Structures are given as structure tokens and as C-alpha cells.
Amino acid sequence: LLPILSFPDPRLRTIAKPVEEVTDEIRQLAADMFETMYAAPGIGLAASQVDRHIQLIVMDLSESKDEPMVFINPKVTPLTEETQPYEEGCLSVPQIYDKVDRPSRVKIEAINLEGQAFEIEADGLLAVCIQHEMDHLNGKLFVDYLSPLKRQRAREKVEKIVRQREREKV
Ligand SMILES: [Zn+2]
Numbered sequence: 784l785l786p787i788l789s790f791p792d793p794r795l796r797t798i799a800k801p802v803e804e805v806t807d808e809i810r811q812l813a814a815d816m817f818e819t820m821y822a823a824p825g826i827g828l829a830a831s832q833v834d835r836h837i838q839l840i841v842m843d844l845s846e847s848k849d850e851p852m853v854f855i856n857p858k859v860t861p862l863t864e865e866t867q868p869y870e871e872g873c874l875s876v877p878q879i880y881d882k883v884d885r886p887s888r889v890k891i892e893a894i895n896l897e898g899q900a901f902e903i904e905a906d907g908l909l910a911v912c913i914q915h916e917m918d919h920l921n922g923k924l925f926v927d928y929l930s931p932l933k934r935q936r937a938r939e940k941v942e943k944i945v946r947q948r949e950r951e952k953v
Contacts, residue, residue: 784818784819784822785815785816785818785819785833786833786834787819787823787828787832787833787874787875787877788831788832788833788834788875789875789876789877789941789945790873790875790876790924790926790937790938790941791938791941792875794834795831795832795875795919795922795924796922797831797836797922798836798920798921798922799829799830799831799836799837799838799839799919799920799921800836800837800838801837801838801856802837802838802839802855802856802894804898805855805894805896805897805898809837809839809855809896810896812830812835812839813839813841813853813896815833816828816830816833816839816841817841817843817851819833819874820841820843820874821843821848823874823877825872825874826842826843826844826908826912827840827841827842827912827915827916828840828841828842828874828916829916829919829920831919831920831922832874832875832919838854838855838856838857838920839853839854839855840853840854840855840857840893840913840916840917840919840920841853842854842912842913842916844908844909844912853895853896854891854893854894854913854916855893855894855895855896856893856894857891857892857893857913857916857917857920858891858892858893859889859890859891859892859913859914859917860889860890860892861886861888861889862886862888862889862890862904863886863887863888864886865886865887865888866884866885866886866887867884867885867887867910867911868882868883868884869882869883869885869908869911870882871883871911871915871925873915873924873925873926875919875924876924876925876926876937876941877941877944877945878940878941878944879926879936879937879940879941881925881929881933883911883915883925883928883929884928885910885911885914885915886910886914887906887910888904888905888906888910889904889905889910889913889914890902890903890904890905891903891904891905891913
């Protein structure tokens with residue numbers, strides 16, 4: 784299990800560098816991230832969140848651990864002005880959920896774990912989740928779209944949950 788960085792570790796603010804080639808290390812690392820992500824549990828994780836500042840995103844929206852998905856050097860374009868609200872979470876802001884307003888349909892341009900490009904169009908949960916993980920790659924957290932009260936309540940409450948994750952190891 785890779786340790787997940789926790790708000791407000793300033794390392795979450797690092798802008799990810801692009802993957803140069805998909806090496807066997809990038810493959811192992813991506814498998815490390817699926818396991819971390821599935822253990823939390825959670826549906827999405829950026830390499831930024833396990834302190835590896837490269838454009839690698841791991842995802843699985845399925846009610847099982849059965850529909851894994853990889854985005855390396857992603858580019859996401861909104862396809863419209865329409866935004867949909869969604870109640871977002873984050874393994875790097877553990878416990879806390881609020882409603883964020885993001886574009887509803889987006890185009891995803893990325894590379895897979897075999898080094899092949901793909902272009903997909905996304906709505907619903909998928910459009911929410913890549914935009915959230917993209918932000919991680921640009922050092923942005925879903926807490927940046929909430930008010931500073933909501934933010935500071937998250938700061939103090941994550942320190943609380945983190946110290947307790949440690950006291951459970953004891
Ligand atoms: Zn997140």
C-alpha cells in the first residue's frame with residue numbers, strides 16, 4: 784500500500800510532469816495505485832496523491848474492483864457550457880464530501896498502459912472523476928471550489944482523521 788498524501792501537504796500542490804515512455808516501472812506504479820485506491824476505498828487516484836508527480840491517473844467507477852482504467856498524459860476539453868453539480872470526495876481529503884460544479888460532457892485524450900492514444904467522450908460520473916483527477920495533476924484540490932470556512936473545517940478534520948489512522952497502527 785502506497786501512503787496517500789493528505790490535505791494540506793504542500794506536495795499535493797506540485798504540477799505533475801508528463802510520462803516520457805510507459806516503462807515497466809510505470810506499469811508496477813499504476814498497479815501499486817489501483818491497490819491503494821481499492822483499499823481506501825475509492826473510485827479515482829492521481830500519482831500526485833502518492834507523491835509521484837507524473838501524468839498518471841488510475842480509475843474504476845464499477846460497483847466491483849472489475850472495470851479498471853488508466854490515463855497517462857491526459858488532456859480534457861469541455862464539450863459544452865452545461866455544468867452538473869456532484870457530491871465529490873477525495874482520498875487526499877479523507878471523510879469530507881461537498882457539491883462541486885463542473886462541465887457535464889468533456890473529451891478525454893490520453894495514453895493507455897500499452898502506449899496507445901485514445902480519444903473518448905464522457906458524461907455523468909466519468910466526466911466528474913477525470914476533471915477531479917486532472918486537477919490533482921495541476922496541484923488543485925476539490926476543496927479549492929469550496930468557501931474557506933468549509934476548507935478550514937476540512938483542514939482541522941483531516942489532521943484529526945490522519946492522527947487516528949496513525950493511532951490505529953499502534
Ligand atoms: Zn482527489
